[PDB]
A paper describes a structure:
Full length BsuDnaG was applied for crystallization trials and the structure of the RPD domain was solved. The results showed that proteolysis occurred in the crystallization drops and yielded a fragment of ~49 kDa. The crystals belonged to space group P61 with cell dimensions of a = b = 117.11 Å, c = 48.86 Å. There was one molecule per asymmetric unit. The RNA polymerase domain (RPD, residues 112–435) could be modeled in the electron density map. Superposition of RPD structure of [name] against that of S. aureus, E. coli and A. aeolicus led to r.m.s.d. values of 1.31 Å, 1.80 Å and 1.73 Å, respectively. Clearly, the structure of BsuDnaG RPD shared similar overall structures with its homologs, except for a slight variation in the orientation of the C-terminal helical bundle. Structural comparison revealed that the orientation of loop1 in BsuDnaG RPD was quite different from that in ZBD/RPD of A. aeolicus; it appeared that the deletion of ZBD resulted in loop1 rotated about 25 degrees anti-clockwise. Our results show that the [name] primase could degrade at the sites in the hinge regions.
Because DNA polymerases are incapable of initiating strand synthesis de novo, RNA primers are made by primase to prime DNA synthesis throughout replication; this priming activity is tightly coupled to the replisome by interactions with other replication partners. The [name] primase is conserved in all bacteria and consists of three functional domains, an N-terminal zinc binding domain (ZBD), a central RNA polymerase domain (RPD) and a C-terminal helicase binding domain (HBD). Previous study indicated [name] [name] primase preferentially initiates primer synthesis at 5′-CTA-3′ sequence in template. To better understand the structure and function of primase and address the interactions between [name] and specific DNA template, we have carried out structural and functional analysis on [name] protein from [name] (BsuDnaG).
Numbering used by the authors: 112 to 435
Write the structure that this text describes.
Amino acid sequence: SGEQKMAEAHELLKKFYHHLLINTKEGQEALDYLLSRGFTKELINEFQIGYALDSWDFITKFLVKRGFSEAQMEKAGLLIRREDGSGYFDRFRNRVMFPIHDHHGAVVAFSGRALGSQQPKYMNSPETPLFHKSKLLYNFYKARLHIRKQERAVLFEGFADVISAVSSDVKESIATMGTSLTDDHVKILRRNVEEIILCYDSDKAGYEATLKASELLQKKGCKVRVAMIPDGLDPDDYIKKFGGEKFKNDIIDASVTVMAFKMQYFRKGKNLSDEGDRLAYIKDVLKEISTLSGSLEQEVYVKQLASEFSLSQESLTEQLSVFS
C-alpha cells in the first residue's frame, strides 16, 4: 500500500524529470551536454532520460503538494532526511536522470549523473522496498526479447555502457547497478539464454569482476565469453573512439573463451622474460587448464603454451597431471 505510493511517485517523476530536460531552460545545460556526448533525442526519448533541477526542495515540495508523505518518499529513496531532523530535501539535484525499470517496465529507482562536482558522480537510489540491485538487471525489460532473438546476452556494469551498446545496435545488453553479479541475476539470465558475454572495464577491478562473474555463470551451465577492450579503455570509451559498428563487430562478436581471457589476465604484473615469472604464469595457467572437462579442451590450451614458449608438451603435460 505504501509501496504503491512509492511506485506512483517514480512513474510520475520519470515523466516530469523528462519534461524538465526537454521543455525548460534549466534543462538546456543538461540537454546540450547530453547531445555533445553522443546522445540523440531518439535515445533521450527512448530511455526517457530526464533532469533534476539544481534545487534542494523543488521535488520535495512537488511531491508534498501532490499528497505524498515525505517519510514514504524517503523510504522510496527519492528524498533524504536532514541529519538534524528539521525536514527533507531532494536526493537528486542537478543530475541527468536515468530511470531504472524493473523486469516488467515499472520504474523503481533512478541513477543521476552529476552535472558538476557533487559526489558521487553517479548517484543511485539506495535499497528501497521497490529497488533491490541484487535482483534487477538494468535494461532487462527492454532487452529480454532481443536476448532471445540473438540467443545471447551482453552483460555490462552500470547503465552508461548499456546505453552506448544499444546505440551500437547491441540491444541484448543489460547491466548490474552498483553491485557484482549475484546468484539471483544468474538464475534470471539462465532462464532466458545460454550464452553470456561479459564486457567490463579493462582496469584491474574490471578484470577481477570479469573473473568472478564468469565463475558464477559457468557453475550454472551458462556458456560464457569475454569481450576484451584493448589498451586501457572501458566500453563507452571504445565506442566513442572507434564507433559502435567496430565495437559490435570486433569486440562483442570476437569475444573469447573464459580460458583465453584467464590466459591474458594472468599475464598482468608478470615479466615473462624473467624465468621465475615465466614459470609461475605457465603453472598458473596449467592449474586452470586442469579444471577443464576433457583432454581435447585441455590439449587445445596446452598447445598455445607449448607454442608461445617453445616448451615440449610432454613437460607441460607432466606438470598438468600434478595439479589433477
